[PDB]
């Protein structure tokens, strides 16, 4: 019965035409609750999840996100030269947040990447840093010697994140609890004398799902390919599995789909 809050921060030297150079996406469990970007310069809730938000709270989120924008711009102007890299474009990333476990205990997370590679991590429980390489080590030693970062982020992860997680869970409880059954389609195309049975589960929420193929009532994983779980724009998800089958055996296979919206797992055929 645990819950999670995560922030995904990206700064970019070359985001693409018309693209913000700095973006924040925030998630509560597997649901986007709000975003920030350097073009609008405003942090805004996803009103479908959070329909009655007070401006005070998002004034606060905006300010804090704008500070993150300045720091990422600061880093992107200094780190490429410190790494002696000739790369054209550069990226800076950070993911941080907290978990509240079922028994009420707390976990904090705080990790950075530069050009898509581990850079620095902070462990709130020990209040210690980990550098990914000797260049990041210089930052680690500076941060820990000044002492201020550990205190700020122990408070941020262990107190502020937890408070906001509880707020978002309450404010967005209708959205978070509303289950959406998948619509399952099973298809078959016959190429080169073999039949590909594909199973597609459309538009489910929440995110966890399993899809298995069976023959004569016995699961068959060795010949199965899974497409993975991918997003729809409305907060639901999509997932798929395929298996290759002799066309003469096409009626003997069953797709098994298990989802929290289904009291019992669903069995589907071609």
């Amino acid at each position: 019965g645990s819950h999670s809050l995560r922030y995904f921060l990206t700064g970019m030297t070359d985001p693409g035409p018309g693209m913000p150079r700095f973006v924040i996406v925030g998630y509560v469990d597997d649901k986007i609750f709000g975003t920030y970007n350097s073009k609008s310069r405003t942090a805004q809730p996803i009103v479908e999840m959070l329909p009655q938000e007070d401006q005070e709270h998002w004034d606060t989120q905006t300010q804090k996100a704008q500070g993150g924008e300045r720091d990422f711009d600061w880093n992107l102007n200094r780190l490429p030269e410190r790494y002696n890299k000739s790369k054209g474009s550069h990226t800076m990333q950070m993911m941080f947040g907290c978990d509240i476990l079922e028994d009420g205990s707390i976990r904090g997370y705080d990790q950075y990447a530069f050009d898509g590679r581990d850079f620095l991590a902070f462990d709130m429980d020990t209040m210690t840093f980990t550098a990914a390489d000797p260049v990041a080590e210089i930052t680690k030693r500076r941060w820990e010697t000044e002492g201020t970062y550990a205190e700020r982020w122990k408070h941020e992860l262990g107190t502020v994140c937890v408070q906001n997680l509880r707020r978002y869970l309450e404010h967005g409880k209708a959205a978070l609890k509303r289950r959406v059954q998948p619509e399952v389609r099973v298809w078959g195309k016959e190429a080169d004398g073999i039949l590909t049975l594909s199973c597609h589960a459309h538009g489910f929420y929440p995110r966890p799902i399993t899809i298995s193929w069976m023959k004569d009532g016995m699961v068959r994983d060795q010949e199965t390919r899974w497409g993975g779980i991918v997003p729809n724009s409305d907060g639901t998800y999509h997932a798929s599995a395929a298996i290759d089958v002799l066309p003469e055996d096409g009626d003997k296979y069953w797709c098994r789909v298990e989802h929290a919206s289904l009291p019992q797992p669903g069995l589907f055929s071609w």
């Binding site: 720091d71 880093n75 200094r78 410190r82 530069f114 930052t139 500076r142 970062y149």
Partner: peptide, 5 residues
């Protein structure tokens, strides 16, 4: 966080 040096 600024990655000072």
């Amino acid at each position: 966080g600024q990655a000072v040096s």
